[PDB]
């Protein structure tokens, strides 16, 4: 009947403090337990891989969020680097309370974990996206830790060439968390993409790298862009969408190009075989740097008869537009392609990945979807109709139909009513009018035993920013309320950030302050007990912040309009004492690249924070163990326990 | 008539700022900024737009990048000189500067190329060309240039207007001249093997090609690849970590009865340690298994007599096999349990008191339950008693610590070596048993037998190896599991992971995969000691090094490049290899891994055919008379 609870994230990162949660449950009033918790290495006797931290839990202060320090000296001396098969380690809580009171076989209760030598964050940018053979390559790296503060650990950098061989290697200390370096491309080197990797010296699994292209090129004077009127084309048998495109052709320095636009058309498959149109070629004069070309509906079906196909054979595929203009007095030419204009079946895209599974019978099922334009932005104001058919538990099936428009950025949140004793749930989701997009989904019920079920609902379906206090409601469904308290914890970036309790009431609520520690993604895992069996549920809430902790604003003032050689005052503004790494890049390099490389923005910084996220899916579970290990936790109460996962697979 | 032109009404050329600095990236600096900072800098001569990015790294507010600045430069009257990528010497090209006029005035601009040494221009370079450029339009001015020099020629193109409206621009840009001939790559592939004697040292020929341009040499690079992984498909294992957890038992009855529970409990713990399957179980099961050995170590100490002799009860006389069987176990439990070292030193002293005159071991009274002895009971009982103490004294040899028992340790190995004179005499006889040969030759290779008396028990054991199907062994038989298990521990010492041991390990894994696991005492303990030694030996690959050294003599003098490859992270290495010419190169190779060497010598080759337009064709012929100015006669 009494339990000791032990929580940790499923993957330990070495050199990083490991967040360990400990909790007493169903303990009498005048009881105080004591003990320790540490990482232990089996098969090297019981030598610890961490110094222990002591914990003390009373009956009224029955939970403690600990920070177990994981040093690299104790992790190598215990023997984890000399281990075979796979990277596995054990978190062990030691207390004589389990032996001298609960009469269990050991004074030990723990869990099985994975360990990783991947730590910190390394960001690195180059001098250029594309370089000629024989040109200097400058690169900088930036060393940070888990707390997004600059780190001082010694790193190793290497440069791999176009075939993939190490041509340069430096191991340098980080007193100021940066490293500038320069090297030269060989004069007779083949074209390709190179790879600059950075890695900590004692952290063996620190993948962080960016790539640059090597190509023979002379720098262009003007960039050619091919913009269609729509990013899609409907292949409905009754209606065909129009095929009109606009070729803006401007110089790099602003002014439009006086020239003649020469256009060829064609079709392209998934393998990469180009099939051109013999005939139907366009040759137009540029006025104000633009060329609005149009492909007629009578000319389009005539070209398919030359290729002996029809309008029903456009199920996959994409329409290929290659354009090469010539400057009408200059004699200079540049090319441009258009390779992302697919033949589609619907102008909208369905994303039901935010809709959770394994949902509680007797609770409302939260159908949350994302409506996006086809190869474009998320669209708002689109109606979504859901036909929900509940299958038979022994009675007749019943059909529900609930319609709701999309609020903002394609977010729709449709609650549908699910009763008790469901067998399965079949969904038929239709979105858009006319020509809808369809999606089918079959979700399974929990098994017919029922220890109790827990429902988590979200009243405000808006994604909050940093500073918004979000409210959530908790109701226990389907069993007798023999419990007294709910217990919750907030999971973010593969650590346990905050952990607290909340007393049980009629209509029970809790407020969670969305902090900047809680990432663009955080989890909310809450549970209780019904006797000696766990009942759990979880929920994923994303944060739409997208802002720095400090700031960095660059500004060149005035009304622009600068000549060459003039003096420019570049203004630098920041919130703290900061090292500011700068660079002024030529926009004409973006037209010379065959594949235009995408550099470093702030959106790549926020997705590096969720690389340490250990959870898969929106949350939930038909079991109470499947809630925990889909959130990324490992747990043991003494009888039920989680198995160790197999890296970040999640089938 | 229609020949209106300007004639030295033009500006001074030196009053035109010449455009010469055209980079593609600039402002590459790191500044230390205390809140606010202004950098006053100078724009380059390239007429594009600039994207200025920035990255802040503060110690208190962390990392932040900036929204980039589109900074646009514009000269309004300018000329753009886009070069070709590479032009050969004595190849006539057309330089095409294009005048650009974004003003609302009909201009008249004279354009000349400044005469630089290394270019043959039209008229020597002093001649200029006028053209009038309309308002809001652009005009090209062609120049037919042939180069002369081999390196680089900095040419300047100057465009100047009149004093009716003073316009002007000048571009100076360095032209790159390609060397004489075409490029030529030569690959000299060499499959490396420093192991055995296939390429431990070698020489490479030179390249005195008669197609070589004599001054157009390039650098020649070396690159080396060690494409040698390790295929995992040869170690399925798949022995169940649940039936081994059923073997973690508490010691129960007397001295015989304890060891059929205690010695499979230690052999389950020593298996699950060395196969590292404690993650499939809770970690409470490990600390349970320590306490089963911790209570069981000092449980047999109640049965310990006052001379190091062991029996089932205290009133029963002592047995020789059982005293060796506990000395085998408690020596391995000295790592787990910090017991008394010197009490086990007198345990082996009683076993040396029953030494025969020829080197045998004799048991005066055996144990009661002879199913604990396993496959020892037979016609060769005297051979199996002698080899089992030889296993037992070698495991107990590590308990002999410091120098206090080291003179008694000399008496241990002298009684082993006299028993090797008796076990080696029975092994060189020939006709032994199936179980009696497997326990004999494994005991010889532990205690370091002489190799003429060691290998004759190796070949006699390998003759008894009746295999069928895709299995190799010596409905489940209970007695044949122990015989295969002693032979698998011996085979890993002579040929570690061999062609037969990879398949003979897979046989008795299937024998332990039946319901109930193994069905006696000795086939449980030794086979879990055999498959634990196999699973380490099948997952221990570490082939590395590949030391390689190259050396040459010539234009550089003597120089040499040495490099080691293998840390088994990197897929290959490439270096610059600044060596001489195509002459005189010596290679010395070391290490012990498979490699692939490629030497990429690049140089300039012959000219051959021009191949001047054989697919497409274009021709143009003009006739008539054009008025000209200046020139000479």
């Amino acid at each position, epitope marked *: 009947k009494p339990r000791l609870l032990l929580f940790s994230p499923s993957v330990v990162h070495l050199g990083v403090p490991l967040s360990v949660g400990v909790q007493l449950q169903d303990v009498p009033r005048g009881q105080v337990v004591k003990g320790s918790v540490f990482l232990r290495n089996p098969s090297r006797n019981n030598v610890p891989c961490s110094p222990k931290v002591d914990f003390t839990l009373s009956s009224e202060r029955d939970f403690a969020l600990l920070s177990l320090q994981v040093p690299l000296k104790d992790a190598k001396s215990c023997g984890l680097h000399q281990l075979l098969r796979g990277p596995e380690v054990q978190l062990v809580a030691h207390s004589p309370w389990l032996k001298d009171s609960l009469s269990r076989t050991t004074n030990i209760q723990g869990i099985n974990l994975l360990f990783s030598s991947r730590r910190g964050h390394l960001f690195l940018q180059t001098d250029q996206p594309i370089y000629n053979p024989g040109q200097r390559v400058r690169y900088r790296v930036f060393a940070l830790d888990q707390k997004m503060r600059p780190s001082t650990d010694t790193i190793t950098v290497m440069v791999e060439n176009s075939h993939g061989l190490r041509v340069r290697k430096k191991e340098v200390y980080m007193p100021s968390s940066i490293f500038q370096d320069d090297f030269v491309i060989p004069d007779i080197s083949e074209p390709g993409t190179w790879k600059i990797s950075a890695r900590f010296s004692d952290g063996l699994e620190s993948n962080s790298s960016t790539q640059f292209e090597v190509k023979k090129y002379v720098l262009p004077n003007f960039e050619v862009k091919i913009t269609p009127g729509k990013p899609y084309i409907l292949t409905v048998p009754g209606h065909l969408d129009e095929m009109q495109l606009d070729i803006q052709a401007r110089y790099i320095y602003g002014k439009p190009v006086q020239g003649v636009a020469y256009v060829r058309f064609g079709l392209l498959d998934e393998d990469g075989k180009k099939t051109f149109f013999r005939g139907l070629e366009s040759q137009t004069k540029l006025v104000n740097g633009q060329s609005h070309i149009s492909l007629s509906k009578a000319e389009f079906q005539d070209a398919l008869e030359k290729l002996n196909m029809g309008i029903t054979d456009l199920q996959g595929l994409r329409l290929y537009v290659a354009a090469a203009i010539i400057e009408s007095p200059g004699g200079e030419m540049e090319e441009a392609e258009l390779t992302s204009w697919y033949f589609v079946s619907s102008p909208f895209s369905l994303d039901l990945s935010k809709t959770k599974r394994h949902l509680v019978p007797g609770a409302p099922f939260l159908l949350q979807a994302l409506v996006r334009e086809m190869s474009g932005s998320p669209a708002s104001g689109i109606p979504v109709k859901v036909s929900a058919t509940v299958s038979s538990p022994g009675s007749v099936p019943e059909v529900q139909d609930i319609q709701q428009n999309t609020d903002g950025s394609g977010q729709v949140s449709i609650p549908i009513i699910i009763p008790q004793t469901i067998s399965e749930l079949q969904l038929s989701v239709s979105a858009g009018s006319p020509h809808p997009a369809i999606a089918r989904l079959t979700v399974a019920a929990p098994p017919s035993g029922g220890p109790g079920f827990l429902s988590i609902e979200r009243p405000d379906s808006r994604p909050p920013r940093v500073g918004d206090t979000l409210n959530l409601n908790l109701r226990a469904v389907g069993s007798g309320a023999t419990f007294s308290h709910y217990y919750y914890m907030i999971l973010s970036r593969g650590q346990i950030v905050f952990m607290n309790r909340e007393p049980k009431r009629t209509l029970t609520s809790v407020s969670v302050f969305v902090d900047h520690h809680l990432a663009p993604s955080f989890y909310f895992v809450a549970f209780y007990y019904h006797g000696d069996h766990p009942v759990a549920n979880s929920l994923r809430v994303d944060v739409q912040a997208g802002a720095c902790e400090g700031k960095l604003e660059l500004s060149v003032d005035g009304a622009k309009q600068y*000549r*060459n*050689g*003039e*003096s420019v005052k570049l203004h630098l503004e920041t919130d703290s004492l900061a090292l500011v790494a700068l660079g002024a890049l030529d926009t004409a390099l973006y037209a010379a690249g065959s594949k235009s490389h995408k550099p470093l923005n702030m959106g790549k910084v926020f997705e590096a924070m969720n690389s340490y996220d250990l959870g898969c899916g929106p949350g939930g579970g038909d079991s109470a163990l499947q809630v925990f290990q889909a959130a990324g936790l490992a747990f043991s109460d003494g009888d039920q326990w989680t198995l160790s996962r197999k890296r970040l697979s999640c089938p | 008539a229609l020949e209106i032109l300007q004639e030295e009404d033009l500006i001074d050329e*030196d009053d035109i*700022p*010449v*455009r*010469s*600095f055209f*980079p593609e990236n*600039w*402002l*590459w600096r790191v500044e230390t900024v205390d809140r606010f900072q*202004i*950098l*006053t*800098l*100078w724009l*380059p*001569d390239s007429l594009t737009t600039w994207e200025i990015h920035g990255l802040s790294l503060s110690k208190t507010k962390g990392l932040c990048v900036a929204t980039p600045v589109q900074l646009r430069v514009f000269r309004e009257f300018h000329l753009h000189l886009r070069l070709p990528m590479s032009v050969r010497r004595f190849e006539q090209l057309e330089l095409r500067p294009v005048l650009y006029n974004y003003l609302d005035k009909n201009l008249t601009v004279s354009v000349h190329v400044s005469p630089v040494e290394g270019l043959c221009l039209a008229g020597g370079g002093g001649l200029a060309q006028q053209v009038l450029v309309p308002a809001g339009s652009a005009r090209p001015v062609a120049f037919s240039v042939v180069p002369t020099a081999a390196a680089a020629v900095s040419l300047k193109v100057v465009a100047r207007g009149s004093f009716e409206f003073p316009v002007g621009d000048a571009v100076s840009k360095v032209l790159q001249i390609e060397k004489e001939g075409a490029i030529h790559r030569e690959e000299l592939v060499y499959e490396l093997n420093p192991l055995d004697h296939r390429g431990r040292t070698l020489e490479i020929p030179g390249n005195s090609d008669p197609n070589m341009i004599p001054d157009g040499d390039f650098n020649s690079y070396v690159r080396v690849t060690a494409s040698d992984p390790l295929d995992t498909l040869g170690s399925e294992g798949a022995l169940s970590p649940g039936g081994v957890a059923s073997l973690l038992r508490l010691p129960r009855g007397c001295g015989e009865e304890t060891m059929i529970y205690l010695a499979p409990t230690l052999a389950a713990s020593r298996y699950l340690d060395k196969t590292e399957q404690w993650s499939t179980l809770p970690p409470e099961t490990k600390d349970h298994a320590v306490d089963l050995i911790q209570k069981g170590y000092m449980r047999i100490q109640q049965f310990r007599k006052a001379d190091g002799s062991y029996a089932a009860w205290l009133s029963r006389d002592s047995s020789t096999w059982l005293t060796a069987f506990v000395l085998k176990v408690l020596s391995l439990a000295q790592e787990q349990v910090g017991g008394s070292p010197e009490k086990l030193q007198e345990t082996s002293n009683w076993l040396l008191s029953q030494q025969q005159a020829d080197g045998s071991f004799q048991d005066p009274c055996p144990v009661l339950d002879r199913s604990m002895q396993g496959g020892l009971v037979g016609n060769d009982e005297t051979v199996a008693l002698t080899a089992f103490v030889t296993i037992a004294l070698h495991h107990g040899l590590a308990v002999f610590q410091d120098e206090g028992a080291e003179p008694l340790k000399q008496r241990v190995e002298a009684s082993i070596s006299k028993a090797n004179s008796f076990l080696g005499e029975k092994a060189s006889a020939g006709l032994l048993g199936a179980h009696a040969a497997a326990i004999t030759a494994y005991a010889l290779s532990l205690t370091k037998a002489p190799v003429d008396l060691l290998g004759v028990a190796h070949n006699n054991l390998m003759a008894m190896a009746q295999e069928t199907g895709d299995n190799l062994y010596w409905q489940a038989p209970a007695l044949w599991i122990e015989t295969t298990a002693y032979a698998l521990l011996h085979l890993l010492l002579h040929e570690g992971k061999a062609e037969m041991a990879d398949q003979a390990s897979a046989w008795l894994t299937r024998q332990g995969s039946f319901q109930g696991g193994f069905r006696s005492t000795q086939d449980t303990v030794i086979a879990l000691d055999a498959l634990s030694a196999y699973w380490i030996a099948s997952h221990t690959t570490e082939e590395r090094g590949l030391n390689v050294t190259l050396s040459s003599t010539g234009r550089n003098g003597f120089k040499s490049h040495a490099l080691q490859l293998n840390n088994r992270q990197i897929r290959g290495l490439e270096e610059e290899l600044q060596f001489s010419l195509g002459s005189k190169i010596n290679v010395k190779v070391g290490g012990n891994s498979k490699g692939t060497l490629k030497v990429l010598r690049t140089y300039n080759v012959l000219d051959m055919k021009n191949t001047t337009c054989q697919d497409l064709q274009i021709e143009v012929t003009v006739k008539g008379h054009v008025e000209y100015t200046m020139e000479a006669n």
Partner: nanobody
Framework: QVQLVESGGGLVQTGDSLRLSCAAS????????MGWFRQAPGKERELVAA????????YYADFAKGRFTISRDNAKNMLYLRMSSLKPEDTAVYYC?????????????????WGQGTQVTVSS
């Protein structure tokens, strides 16, 4: 290296004009950017004026706008400083300095080559 020689300075009264000169040896003078600095006795170096390596645009300090004029002649390898309206707080050793194209203006340490400096003393 490319070297610098200053001339033109001397004793003068308050409110007069002066023409400074900076001679430059070497051949790659058009590739480097120039700038006249000054250093008061007791204080560090500060900028007076600076001109581009091509001689296309100029930069002046906040006290030097309007009163002073910098010019470049790349055909004679000369640098001038046409000065007017002098004050007694302008008394400094006037230096002539060379730097690259990607150089900053207020940083004195980032310039490459230097001269010896000429003395301009303004009395009242």
């Amino acid at each position: 290296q490319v070297q610098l020689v200053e001339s033109g300075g001397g004793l003068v009264q308050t409110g007069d004009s002066l023409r400074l000169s900076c001679a430059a040896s070497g051949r790659t003078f058009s590739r480097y950017a120039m700038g006249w600095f000054r250093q008061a006795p007791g204080k560090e170096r500060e900028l007076v004026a600076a001109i581009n390596w091509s001689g296309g645009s100029t930069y002046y300090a906040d006290f030097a706008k309007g009163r002073f004029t910098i010019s470049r002649d790349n055909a004679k390898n000369m640098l001038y400083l046409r000065m007017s309206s002098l004050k007694p707080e302008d008394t400094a050793v006037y230096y002539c300095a060379a730097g690259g194209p990607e150089v900053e203006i207020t940083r004195a340490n980032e310039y490459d080559y230097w001269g010896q400096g000429t003395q301009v003393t303004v009395s009242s």
